[PDB]
Design a binder for this molecule. Structure first.
Ligand SMILES: Cc1ccc(C(=O)Nc2ccc(CN3CCN(C)CC3)c(C(F)(F)F)c2)cc1C#Cc1cnc2cccnn12
Length: 280
């Protein structure tokens, strides 16, 4: 309502800055508090004098355009001068990889594994529809909140090893992306498949006992990860479709989401009945 108003910009002093999250594993991401409203937030920062200004500013632009229940939601930025902030709502249970590695499987049961996958493929259908490419989909890049709410994120984490002049997470990376640097919503589909396998194993590292140097060549001979113990057949079938060698042969996220939503609804019906028996 005044000449230098920007609806996304906040004042840094609105925000109480506290500890770095995850002991550094998320980069420059800090727990903060938006004082006026209490709200605990997460704050990504870039200090002055860096060669990352353009990339950070590009990140802010993108988030201003992303609005979905299962994608991280921008609350505000500080980008009028250094240090830059990007502020989003705090997700209390941390990243999905660790959550799966530390959980109680009585709570995180098979209906919850289906819930997680449905939420993630819904965030990816949205990106698919808006013609975005995530480019680093993985359980380390999903966040968990109350009642197994899952939101997709991207910390810019690049485990990652040297490849084609940069750092790639080989075991999540689609073949055309490794071979030709070709990234698309279809390579995200390949990665979602590895994420499904991460969920199914409660967070095991992919391609167990296989050294990264052998992954591409095995994939090119049509080797794929085997079905995890206890992974339902239909879910494995979806994994193998995400891992079609030709990107065009892989399902869309719309299709994947509809599949998971159906299975989640069926599973949830069984879950509520067992619980209703428990109560009583
Ligand atoms: C402070 C912060 C800043 C930024 C982001 C962030 O996720 N950035 C992001 C940037 C771009 C994109 C889309 N592009 C991907 C690349 N692609 C080439 C283009 C499309 C997306 C996506 F989610 F939409 F994918 C996310 C997360 C946080 C957090 C947090 C937080 C909240 N609670 C907790 C608890 C523990 C740890 N962290 N934490």
């Amino acid at each position: 309502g005044s000449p230098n108003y920007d609806k996304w910009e906040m004042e840094r002093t609105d925000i109480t800055m506290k500890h770095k999250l995850g002991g550094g594993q998320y980069g420059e991401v800090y727990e903060g508090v938006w004082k006026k409203y209490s709200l605990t937030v997460a704050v990504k920062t870039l200090k002055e004098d860096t060669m990352e200004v353009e990339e950070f500013l590009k990140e802010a632009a993108v988030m201003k355009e992303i609005k979905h229940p299962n994608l991280v939601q921008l609350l505000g930025v500080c980008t009028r001068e250094p240090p830059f902030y990007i502020i989003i709502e705090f997700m209390t249970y941390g990243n999905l990889l660790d959550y799966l590695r530390e959980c109680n499987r009585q709570e995180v049961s098979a209906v919850v594994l289906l819930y997680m996958a449905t939420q993630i493929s819904s965030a990816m259908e949205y990106l698919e529809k808006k013609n975005f490419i995530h480019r680093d989909l993985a359980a380390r890049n999903c966040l968990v909140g109350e009642n197994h709410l899952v939101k997709v994120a991207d910390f810019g984490l690049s485990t990652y090893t040297a490849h084609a002049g940069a750092k790639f997470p080989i075991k999540w990376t689609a073949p055309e992306s490794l071979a030709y640097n070709k990234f698309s919503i279809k390579s995200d589909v390949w990665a979602f498949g590895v994420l499904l396998w991460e969920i199914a194993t409660y967070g095991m590292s992919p391609y167990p006992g296989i050294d990264l140097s052998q992954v591409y060549e095995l994939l090119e001979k049509d080797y794929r990860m085997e079905r995890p113990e206890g992974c339902p057949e239909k879910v494995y079938e979806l994994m193998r479709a995400c891992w079609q060698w030709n990107p065009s042969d892989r399902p869309s996220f719309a299709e994947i989401h509809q599949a998971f939503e159906t299975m989640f609804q069926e599973s949830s019906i069984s879950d509520e009945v067992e619980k209703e028996l428990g109560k009583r």
